[PDB]
Amino acid sequence: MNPPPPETSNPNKPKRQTNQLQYLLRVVLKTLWKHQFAWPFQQPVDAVKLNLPDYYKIIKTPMDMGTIKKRLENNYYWNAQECIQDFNTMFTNCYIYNKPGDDIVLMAEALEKLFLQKINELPTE
Ligand SMILES: CC(=O)Nc1ccc(-c2c(-c3nc4ccc(N5CCN(C)CC5)cc4[nH]3)[nH]c(C)c2C(C)=O)cc1
Questions:
Q1: What is the dihedral of CA 95, 101, 107, 110, to 10 degrees?
Q2: Ligand 1: centre distance to CA 13 (Å)
Q3: Domain contains 10
Q4: Cβ atoms of 78 and 12 closer than 8 Å
Q5: Residue 30's domain spans which residues?
Q6: Atom 14, ligand 1: which residue's CA is nearest?
Q7: How far apart are alpha carbons 59 and 120 in whole angstroms?
Q8: Of all helices (H) and strands (E), which one includes residue 84?
Q9: Residue 6: inside a domain, yes or no?
Q10: What residues does ligand 1 touch, defined as CB less than 6 Å away?
Q11: Domain count, the chain
């Protein structure tokens, strides 16, 4: 069964627009989004549709690039590191729920390498 997806708006949360967060949306997120391995990560895992009744019994901090994109577009984040943590959470969830050599893990590994390549250098403030 599906829990509520992670929030993408929160009026009491303090927000900030930074050059680095703009970069995370304009180039980092949008480049990863077009990768041929991006499709499993563009939306919250639907455990009912995907027939994974144990997904959310295992994964307790779900995250996906669709949620990250909406957070960025809604200026949800305070700084780039908060956004980077969401990316890292998404990748780690994939490695936790699956196992080495799974097709989904191969995809996450390729995306994670591209992700780190893109954030290795960020713009300044
Ligand atoms: C038997 C088998 O392979 N089970 C299975 C089921 C689910 C997943 C799986 C998926 C996933 N599976 C999708 C199937 C469809 C879509 N679509 C919506 C996007 N749209 C362009 C195309 C359709 C998105 C998807 N994300 N994501 C993650 C993070 C997964 C895991 C387990 O970590 C991996 C394997």
A1: 90
A2: 31
A3: no
A4: no
A5: 18-122
A6: 40
A7: 28
A8: helix 80-97
A9: no
A10: 39-43, 45, 50, 52, 94, 97-98, 104
A11: 1
